[PDB]
Amino acid sequence: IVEGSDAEIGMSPWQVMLFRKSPQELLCGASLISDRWVLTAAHCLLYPPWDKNFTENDLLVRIGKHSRTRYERNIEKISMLEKIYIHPRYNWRENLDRDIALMKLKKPVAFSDYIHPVCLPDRETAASLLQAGYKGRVTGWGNLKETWTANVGKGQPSVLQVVNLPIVERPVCKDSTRIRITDNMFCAGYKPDEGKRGDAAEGDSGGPFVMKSPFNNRWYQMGIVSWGEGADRDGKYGFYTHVFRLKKWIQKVIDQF
């Protein structure tokens, strides 16, 4: 996350960290949607151009984890994965269309003041909140800056980072990049003239883009960090998987397995 701030304790209890099992390596973000299901981005698990193709046994998740390195027993939880499900029509070859995956936890995680699921949007909440200019919040353990060269440190935070960003109009998103955008994505970030900055970055994929509903005071996951050009570049915007557009697939996978 670029130009974000440190998260307060318990501010994003649905935050999930996805790690390589061996050797231990933080890979991506993810979100908790029930006591046994986690949502993430497909490219965190499968992306052939980077020789990435993980199986359930190659990974683990940490939940309620506040410090990047400090273990807080009785607060953070570790869970193994029973199964991974990647959208069958995830287009990794071209533009990461349908960049979404579900992961089933081997054992359910207990809810606490630090671990809680986020809501998925129903049609009317999505219609209301997914409007250009409305802001959402993105969280992650990813890079703090774009690099220039690989040997310059990209910053690794010690506390989850959070940034609030406005949804951008579809024609503006489309014109900002040569990648072919689909209705399964939306983009967010500040325009060059808005006097504010901020963006997700590499390492933040799979993390949630959430919005608070003014109707029932609950947080809804509207997007999943998916892709962008560098990070926090003027005139560029971050792209997110449109969770409501892919809700019928989530249902089919879960209420079918």
Partner: protein, 43 residues
């Protein structure tokens, strides 16, 4: 209110409880930046 969409037999528990944080919404306390979000709905 909240109406559930998924079947608990396969979804597991928590859907009716979702999106309310014990240390904020359940204690009627705002986190430090959520007003920026709420304000964007009106401005």
């Amino acid at each position: 209110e909240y109406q559930t969409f998924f079947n608990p037999r396969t979804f597991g528990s928590g859907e009716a409880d979702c999106g309310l944080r014990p240390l904020f919404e359940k204690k009627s306390l705002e986190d430090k930046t959520e007003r920026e979000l709420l304000e964007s709905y009106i401005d």
